[PDB]
Structure 1
Amino acid sequence: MIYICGECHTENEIKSRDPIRCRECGYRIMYKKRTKRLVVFDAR
């Protein structure tokens, strides 16, 4: 599990039941990394 900070944008490997703070920040808005699967789109 790798999450991206609010504005620091550092990948922070947290685990479960862990506060969502950040390395090099304290900001608690952590988005998730984009998926790894082949996503098919239609140009219509």
Structure 2
Amino acid sequence: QPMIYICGECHTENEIKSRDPIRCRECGYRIMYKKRTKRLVVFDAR
């Protein structure tokens, strides 16, 4: 539900809800990245 994103410039973990302009609350940077999922991906070391 929270969908916490990371700032491209300040690297801050901040929560943003839908219908919200994409803005970091710590520095106002406009580019955000999603965090790595918690799902379990498996690799054959090959």
- TM-score range (shorter-chain normalised) is 0.7 to 0.9
Distance across 2 between alignment mates of 1:15 and 1:29: 15
Partner of residue 17, structure 1: 19
Distance across 1 between alignment mates of 2:15 and 2:32: 11
Q: Secondary structure at the residue paired with 2:33? A: strand
What stretches of structure 2 of length at least 5 have no aligned partner? none
Q: RMSD of the alignment, in Å? A: 0.8
Distance across 1 between alignment mates of 2:38 and 2:26: 26
Distance across 1 between alignment mates of 2:45 and 2:6: 30
**Displacement, 1:6?**
1.0
Number of corresponding residues:
44
Percent of aligned pairs sharing the same letter: 100
The runs of 4+ residues in structure 1 deviating greater than 4 Å are none
What stretches of structure 1 of length at least 5 have no aligned partner? none
**Deviation string for 1:2-37 (max 9, x for gaps)?**
000012111111111101111111111100000101
TM-score (norm 2): 0.84
